[PDB]
């Protein structure tokens, strides 16, 4: 039954028992229920009035932290001879590339959230002259819209795409993207295929497609080359979460799938998640005096 829980539960004092037919420490794991044995039933307890808050494990607080989702470096230079990100890049938006954010999200089967996006830009001179205060354009290109082909192509005129223009000397650029799934929640895992034929992608719900992020430098090239790094941070907010999952144990291999190998030896090997001890009777950090 649903109830409002702001603090951890109190403990009541308890007496000696010795009641026939009452065995609160016995349980039946086969039912699939977790043990209902209370501490007051296992031991004699005192009264404790418990004031510890539980707000820091709220799902909103657990997930609504800004985390790196994308990082791209490209040369800001005259590109006429290059073969390369020619003062712009395109990124196909995903949550799977950086493992710390990926593992937290993959604790759940379904998520509904709005995404707070922070864009941080940094510049370095190619191997010094000072650093230019460049203007950047980020443009969101939804599904079926055309991506830019050049730094100066007319796609950047952004008649109906959302664009943000920001300087390097500004605070990081920030926007919110709404929850935009064609379903009521994102499918964090998808035991299915994307297309009506048999060759479609396994494991990616088509319903969750966000689109492309296109970032250009708006300035014409200078006489000298710079390296520009763009970092994108996502913070989920207004979160609903359904069906908690076993956490990832083996290292991630791919953004595209759940494939696994394990580490070569424990911990987090395929044959042994926990590191070994000499025996089930060995206490590894035993206090001795």
């Amino acid at each position: 039954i649903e109830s409002i829980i702001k603090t951890a539960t109190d403990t009541v004092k308890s007496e000696i028992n010795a009641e026939l037919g009452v065995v609160p420490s016995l349980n039946a794991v086969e039912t699939g229920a977790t043990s209902n044995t209370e501490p007051e039933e296992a031991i004699q307890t005192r009264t404790v009035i418990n004031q510890h808050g539980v707000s820091e494990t709220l799902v909103e607080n657990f997930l609504s932290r800004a985390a790196l989702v994308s990082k791209r470096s490209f040369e800001y230079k005259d590109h006429t001879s290059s073969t390369a990100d020619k003062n712009f890049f395109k990124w196909t938006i995903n949550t799977r590339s950086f493992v710390q954010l990926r593992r937290k999200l993959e604790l759940f089967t379904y998520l509904r959230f709005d995404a707070e996006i922070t864009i941080l830009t940094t510049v370095a001179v190619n191997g010094y002259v000072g650093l230019p205060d460049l203007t950047l354009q980020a443009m969101f290109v939804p599904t079926g819209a055309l991506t830019p082909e050049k730094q100066d192509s007319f796609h950047w005129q952004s008649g109906s795409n959302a664009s943000v223009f920001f300087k390097i000397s500004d605070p990081p650029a920030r926007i919110t993207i709404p929850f935009m799934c064609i379903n009521s929640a994102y499918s964090v895992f998808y035991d299915g295929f994307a297309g009506f034929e048999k060759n479609g992608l396994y494991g990616i719900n088509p319903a969750d497609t966000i689109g492309n992020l296109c970032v250009r430098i708006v300035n014409e090239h200078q006489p000298v080359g710079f390296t520009v790094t763009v970092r994108v941070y996502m913070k989920p907010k207004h979160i609903k979460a359904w069906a908690p999952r076993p956490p990832r144990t083996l290292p991630y291999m791919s953004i595209a799938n759940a494939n696994y190998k394990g580490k070569e030896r424990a911990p987090n090997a395929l044959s042994a998640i926990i590191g070994n001890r000499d025996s089930v009777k060995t206490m590894p950090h035993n206090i001795v005096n």
Binding site: I16, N17, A18, L20, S25, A42, Q44
Partner: protein, 238 residues
């Protein structure tokens, strides 16, 4: 229903799924000494959960030649945990006891143990005029073995021992026995090192038998002191 039992005392708990009710000796329950029966005028210590908890003794092997086993109370517990420490530092003690005896076997085994709590089990020696000595009586946690269980080592009889608080473990029926002992003494308190109120006796009136492959069949004793009080604090005899 009354084949399942849970006992909770202090930080300890025992469950059995094959009880045969349980015995409250003479229909009494343990209690603290009331003011209208008290003698020693100092304020008692009542450690509660530090003492009033199950202590498990060393198990004994049930073998076809066994005569049976005994433990004296408080002697068997006088060196165990915080009960032992309170015993060693106090002139006077008082408590009840909760006794739980455990023995399981297969559905192909047979055998019956009489589990009997005897008050003032003053032992006799066999075939001598000399009274039993201190080392014959004071066995501690290990307990003793019956010399002549047929006469309870006291020239009386096993046959009439059912006049004392008892249960049976009949391997076909049950795997545990429980007896609750009140304080049982002529004085309201006693010196714990020189007098035993109760003797637990476990006697195999029907021997263990089977035609399956043999296993070790142990008997295990768990005892919880109940409503412990101690008076006359001094240095530990220990």
């Amino acid at each position: 229903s009354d084949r399942v039992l849970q006992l909770k005392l202090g930080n300890s708990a025992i469950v059995t799924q094959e009880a045969a009710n349980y015995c409250c000796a003479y229909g009494e329950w343990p209690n603290y000494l009331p003011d209208h029966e008290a003698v020693a005028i100092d304020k008692p210590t009542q450690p509660e959960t530090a003492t009033d908890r199950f202590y498990t003794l060393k198990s004994v092997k049930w073998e076809t030649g066994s005569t049976g086993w005994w433990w004296k109370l408080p002697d068997a517990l006088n060196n165990i945990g915080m009960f032992g420490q309170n015993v060693q530092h106090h002139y006077l003690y008082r408590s009840g006891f909760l006794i739980h005896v455990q023995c399981n076997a297969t559905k192909f085994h047979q055998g019956a143990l009489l589990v009997v709590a005897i008050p003032e089990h003053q032992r006799g020696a066999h075939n001598t005029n000399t009274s039993p000595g201190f080392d014959d009586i004071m066995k501690g946690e290990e307990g003793g073995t019956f010399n002549h269980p047929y006469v309870l080592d006291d020239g009386t009889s096993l046959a009439c021992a059912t006049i004392f608080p008892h249960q049976w473990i009949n391997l076909r029926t049950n795997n545990s026995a429980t007896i609750v002992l009140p304080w049982m003494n002529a004085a309201p308190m006693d010196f714990p090192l020189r007098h035993n109120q109760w003797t637990l006796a476990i006697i195999p009136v029907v021997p263990l038998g089977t035609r399956t492959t043999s296993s070790m069949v142990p008997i295990t004793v768990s005892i919880a002191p109940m409503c412990c009080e101690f008076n006359g604090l001094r240095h530990a005899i220990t």
